[PDB]
Point group: C3
Chain length 435, copies 3
């Protein structure tokens, strides 16, 4: 299962063992609620005005390397469908197909065959239960049943109200679990995809959008926009990097280097999907949920940067500085510690206290027997996930650089770019020498 | 209406056709709820203890270029009013003016004439409905009416609880739609401003704050802080930029350049308001809602950077790198595609599939007939907004630069700054030549 | 109390007078709800199916200098406990200890002695109130009491549903105020710590996590993860910095410099905790709530950068540019104004209007008599906190630099790094001179 290697030479760690679940596409579907246009009945008269107020609100609704990412439009697929429902006869084409069945496909005269779904029939209820008796007296409940149907409308309306028509995650009121699962059952997708979504509906919900579309002809329509997971069960690995600095006694005489390529990496279609912001990803035990909108597509060679950062096949990205501050990175199965200067850095067991005091430099410790890590005044709990760690001994590459000609304000840089800068300044040095 | 030009020479696009709605100021108003200090009645006894618990909770409450932005204090206007209500007699000055009318102006003895507003009178209700009968028996409902008044208190209290006294957006419980609209009617603002806010109350709500102020003398007061839109119906345009790189076969021999000045631009008072984070802005069809807190004020000359980026009147901002990664930017009426290296970049129609395969470089495609764009493993839906696009053919300016003396780690840079760097290094070259 | 000095020489301001409250550790505790496994009764039959649906949802849940910060794992302490509850007999060890008392310590056979707490006993209720009568008829309410117990379950379930098992802030449904306060009473902490948390429960709530742990053996368990405030009542001060530029008439001939070390500073354990993102901190009157996860530990010498930025004991961090844009920073007791170019910058009184027009450069004004500040098209309200300001006159240090050899794209830089860059280029100049 989960494993982790630490590289002393580059102050970085890789956690492998994970399986992908990447949102690669969207599945849109039109969700409809049909509406009515209007002593134990005083309850019903109350709920009935809660009703009109919701309808009223609804009508008011009308009238390091992350900077390298592109810029999408997350709900462009859903709004594309909404804009079509505004065509005339298009709300009736839906209203007609959803007469004798609660789920139908409406060819929207735009290209898409959209799955339409009537989740709530208030129009029918109010007109075939409340309307005949509103012409004084109430039976049994009924009162209960209406309060339940209606409350859902109020919840949906409250969400669209506070979010100005677009919500996420998709609540159980936008789409109940039984509705969602039947939607999943009728998706043109592999059985693996269906079981993945069913075992993780709340994650699925979190990657979905609900877009308020239209109120017209006693019908409320919103578009639910669900994730397509086109990439599933491919290898994933997370890269943790921390500043690697020299440790000369004299303050400010030090140089530093950080691999800037931290994030999630997943094998994808012959390339590797890279996610520079490792919080656009959510881990569940050993399954990594990601969104390809927040990714770059890179050559698979990129993994060579961990094995060997000076390699000729991929140019590994680094940043440089003279800023030797202490800090820690909490990995999947341990902790990276960049201890510099006068800082007090330790690792501790819950019951025994400090078991390791860190030297200046960059070091690593596994969660096996260690509960917390301390850098300066910052206490970090480590992840207590079960796995195996490997410490890969090696000379910190920062020691291979002469501080005199080291370039120290590079951010969008790399190993070859830095060497190029060094060569250039050694050229100048050997040319003034001959003077 | 909406239109868009793409500039091949600078890998950028401008969407024009939009109308401004900029929050330029705040409108504060004190909102008050008067409180009471204490078999079908067992319901009322229940709601009455829900009441005391809310009061209890309430009392506990007491005792690219974005880095160039300034730093405001969003609720400083509202807290300014709150701090005054803590003066003595100031809660009574309010409580006295709101005796026979539900809406009054209280001169707060600080300068401001604040609009005071009593939205809920629980004190009166409990003491003139529940208190006389609590001395055993219940009439009719009444039970219903109290549950409704009280539920609002509980909703307001829940919001102030989970947000530690400051909430946004302002919910329909903080301020109902009928209350908000009457507030809007009595605002010292132009009719255009009133219709704008009325046609978009949920957006208005989203730009408002609710600040819990005080509980004192059987009175709950919070300050609602509503947006003033001082700039309305002025031209707006959004700028989309993407990395422009050379495309030499040999990996890593390439240079790149990105216009760093993407964002919203709105004509404002003889200058142009620039919003570097184009998600501090929300578009509704063709109206752009923005906040001037998140803006810079620039010369109107800034638009010349699109027509002609080498112009003498404004120095256009760019960043440089050697990092030729592929990506896409989804514009208002199409997509910009920066395809580099081995990446597979295409555009597709829903029903027909791939209709264009992109060459290495920077290119553009309109939403007219194109539904999705693909860069590497990333599928992007384009916006299906109705508009007209224009492709402005031109030589990519990156081809005008000799890679040998190109400065490649500039972020906070510009066209003239880069030329200055180039001149300097050509000076050195022509001085070593004469050796 | 609160005071503020402005430094004209470096365009910066320091607000002192604050007292710390730093989350330094976590306090975890297992919270349990015991569950049942199954005409006025039609209400109860309703609430009973709301019940089963919640249980159903719950079971589905199973199966400038911020870039210098380290990377923690916020809920690693809580999940550590959760993973233990999944051991066998571990849910029964809890269920057994919580038989005759509602609060017990369960030695989890892992090391920790965790505080276990049964907040809601639905199993007992349903089986000792509803189950004997479900074998037709209902007494009194009871109906009310069940609706209240059950509603809490539904609220807890709704939160865990929409947040996929991890929530924050911890709601009054996860943990009521009376439960929280008893938890606080039994914490191994100083009386100062207890009074601090009791006077600020909503802030405490905002720094807490609730982590859904397990459903097993008619028991629901979640881990509430509360903040430990190990540092309390130590001096804090916030640093405000703004761009300091030259003001030569000719556009683009100017140089700029910004102290990049803005944020919160708190005295902590012989060092100083620095918080580069001053919105990971929340002020309540004069108490600063912070999280040490978002901090660096620095030498106490760092405060010398305000007194004297050219000092030999700490190297003060600055960034440089040629980008002279106007902006403002709203401080605790006034405003910093960086006015450059053609921008219109003013300060105004509510009742009197413009009382100061700013010259080009960097200037400051206190909240005493000033209500708003205007830079370009941006209106800023100042904070109306009561305090004393001091303007420290001084030559802006930017005027000490020759523009010809000034390094203008440094971000991760400092005063000594810049001088070093200058010396190097003056070396080259004096060596070409002798030619
Ligand atoms: O995003 C960046 N940049 C880009 C960058 N370069 C610059 C040069 C001069 C002036 C400003 C510059 N900025 C803007 C940084 C604004 C952060 O709030 C960085 C440069 N050096 C070190 C870390 C950097 N990061 C971190 C990932 C957050």
């Amino acid at each position: 299962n989960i494993t982790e290697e630490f590289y002393q030479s580059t102050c970085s760690a890789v956690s492998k063992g994970y399986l992908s679940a990447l949102r690669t596409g969207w599945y849109t579907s039109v969700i409809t609620i049909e509406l009515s246009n209007i002593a134990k009945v005083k309850l019903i008269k109350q709920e009935l005005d809660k009703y009109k107020n919701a309808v009223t609100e609804l009508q008011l609704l009308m009238q390091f390397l992350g900077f390298l990412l592109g810029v999408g439009s997350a709900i462009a697929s859903g709004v594309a469908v909404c804009k079509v429902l505004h065509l005339e006869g298009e709300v009736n084409k839906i209203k007609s197909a959803l007469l004798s069945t609660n789920k139908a496909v409406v060819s929207l005269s735009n290209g898409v065959s959209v799955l339409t779904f009537k989740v709530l029939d208030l129009k029918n209820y109010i007109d075939k239960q409340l309307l005949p008796i509103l012409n004084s007296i109430s039976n049994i409940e009924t009162v209960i049943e209406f309060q339940q149907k209606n409350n859902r409308l109020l919840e949906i309306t409250r969400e669209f109200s506070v979010n100005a028509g677009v919500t996420t995650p998709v609540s159980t009121y936008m789409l109940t679990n039984s509705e969602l699962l039947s939607l999943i059952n009728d998706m043109p997708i592999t059985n693996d995809q269906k079981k993945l979504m069913s075992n993780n509906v709340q994650i699925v919900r979190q990657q979905s959008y609900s877009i308020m579309c239209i109120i017209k002809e006693e019908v409320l329509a919103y578009v639910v926009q669900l994730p397509l997971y086109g990439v599933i069960d491919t290898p994933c690995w997370k890269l943790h990097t921390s500043p690697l600095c020299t440790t000369n006694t004299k303050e400010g005489s030090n140089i530093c280097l950080t691999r800037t390529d931290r994030g999630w990496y997943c094998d994808n279609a012959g390339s590797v999907s890279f996610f520079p912001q490792a919080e656009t990803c959510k881990v569940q035990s050993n399954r990594v949920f990601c969104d390809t909108m927040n990714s770059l597509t890179l050559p698979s060679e990129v993994n060579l940067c961990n094995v060997d950062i000076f390699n000729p096949k991929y140019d590994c990205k680094i940043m440089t500085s003279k800023t030797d501050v202490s800090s820690s990175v909490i990995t999947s199965l341990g902790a990276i510690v960049s201890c510099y200067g006068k800082t007090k850095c330790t690792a501790s067991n819950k019951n025994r206290g400090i078991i390791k005091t860190f030297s200046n430099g960059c070091d690593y410790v596994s969660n096996k027997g260690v509960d917390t890590v301390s850098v300066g005044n910052t206490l970090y709990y480590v992840n207590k996930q079960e796995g195996k760690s490997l410490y890969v001994k090696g000379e910190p590459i920062i020691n291979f650089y002469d501080p005199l000609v080291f370039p120290s304000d590079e951010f969008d840089a790399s190993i070859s770019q830095v060497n190029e800068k060094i060569n250039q300044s050694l050229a100048f040095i050997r040319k003034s020498d001959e003077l």
